[PDB]
Enzyme design. Structure first.
Site: not given
Ligand SMILES: CCOC(=O)c1c(C)nn(-c2ccc(OC)cc2)c1C
Ligand SMILES: [Mg+2]
Ligand SMILES: [Zn+2]
Length: 326
Positions: A75, A79, A115-116, A233, A236, A284, A287
């Site tokens: 962050h 980013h 934003h961050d 956001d 990635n 990953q 996610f």
């Molecule tokens: C390679 C980048 O992606 C992530 O792993 C990632 C990011 C950025 N944010 N989060 C994430 C963390 C907590 C959450 O809950 C609030 C939501 C997303 C993840 C897993």
């Molecule tokens: Mg943020």
């Molecule tokens: Zn961000």
């Protein structure tokens, strides 16, 4: 200099998904946010449209960039620059051609830039659980996101930093409201509700005979802008694998540092934050499956078929990460 020349060449890809943002950060002396914002403002003719003095824009951008922490692995200013450039590409989607006004474009780009800002490298839940001054100030709701907004707007008051000085009072008020609505929507706790409303819009979608979206009221327009910056956001995993892998290494470093603070304080370690019990690859795939793909598939449906190449890259990267799991 050769360095200045190579930087200019890399910036020629500013309209493309997959810009080499890390190379730009290196070549610019760690000023990717300033140089990418300047490039985009010139490309969209925003300085002329809003009578922004060039020196004022650069002064504000450098000050804003200085308020991103150089010791936070994910962050940071890189980013921020990435989210700005990603939003800039999404705004050029053929299905959104001539949909948003110059003020709305300005709002979405500025929101992405700030934003961050001043992110400390720990989550909202960590700030709440540690009885932090930030969580106390903001009553445990969108703690970081309120703070990012406060800092981004406050910096406009520094010497020669008011880039909006020549906007009308009404324009200034509208832009402020839009930016706040957009940045608050980047809080992940709002993701499920944003996605549900995006799906509802896709189902009741109205378009011209060329597939351009018709959005008349503020509620629908801001909803599309909120989801656009949220998509940026969370972009990635939709980028070329070499870039995605670097983003993954960075967020994992940041997460592990938070988990180290949690472990020593005797707190339960947050998901993905324990360097001694991590499964980066499985995380990953999880996610993408549960958050990123549902969001991007819905966005792709909204602007069909303009986001097909983005969705294809996402699916390619998911397949690769899955293959690394025995
Ligand atoms: C390679 C980048 O992606 C992530 O792993 C990632 C990011 C950025 N944010 N989060 C994430 C963390 C907590 C959450 O809950 C609030 C939501 C997303 C993840 C897993
Ligand atoms: Mg943020
Ligand atoms: Zn961000």
């Amino acid at each position: 200099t050769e360095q200045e020349d190579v930087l200019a060449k890399e910036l020629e890809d500013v309209n493309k998904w997959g810009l080499h943002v890390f190379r730009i950060a290196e070549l610019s002396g760690n000023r990717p946010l300033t140089v990418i914002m300047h490039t985009i403002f010139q490309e969209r003719d925003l300085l002329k449209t809003f009578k922004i003095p060039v020196d004022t824009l650069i002064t504000y951008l450098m000050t804003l960039e200085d308020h991103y922490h150089a010791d936070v692995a994910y962050h940071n200013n890189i980013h921020a620059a990435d989210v700005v450039q990603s939003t800039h590409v999404l705004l050029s989607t053929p299905a959104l051609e001539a949909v948003f006004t110059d003020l709305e474009i300005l709002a979405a780009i500025f929101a992405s830039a700030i934003h961050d800002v001043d992110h400390p490298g720990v989550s909202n839940q960590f700030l709440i659980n540690t009885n932090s001054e930030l969580a106390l100030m903001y009553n445990d709701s969108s703690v970081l996101e309120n703070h990012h907004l406060a800092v981004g707007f406050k910096l406009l008051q520094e010497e020669n930093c008011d880039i909006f000085q020549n906007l009308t009072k009404k324009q200034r008020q509208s832009l402020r409201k839009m930016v706040i609505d957009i940045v608050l929507a980047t809080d992940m706790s709002k993701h499920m509700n944003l996605l549900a409303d995006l799906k509802t819009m896709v189902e009741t979608k109205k378009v011209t005979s060329s597939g351009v979206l018709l959005l008349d009221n503020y509620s629908d327009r801001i909803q599309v802008l909120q989801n656009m910056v949220h998509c940026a956001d969370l972009s990635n995993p939709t980028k070329p694998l070499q870039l995605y892998r670097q983003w993954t290494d960075r967020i994992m470093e940041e997460f592990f540092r938070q988990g180290d603070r949690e472990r020593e304080r005797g707190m339960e370690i947050s998901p993905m934050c324990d360097k001694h019990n991590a499964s980066v690859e499985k995380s990953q795939v999880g996610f993408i499956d549960y958050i990123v793909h549902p969001l991007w598939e819905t966005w792709a449906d909204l602007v069909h078929p303009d986001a097909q190449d983005i969705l294809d890259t996402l699916e390619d990267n998911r397949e690769w990460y899955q293959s690394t799991i025995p």
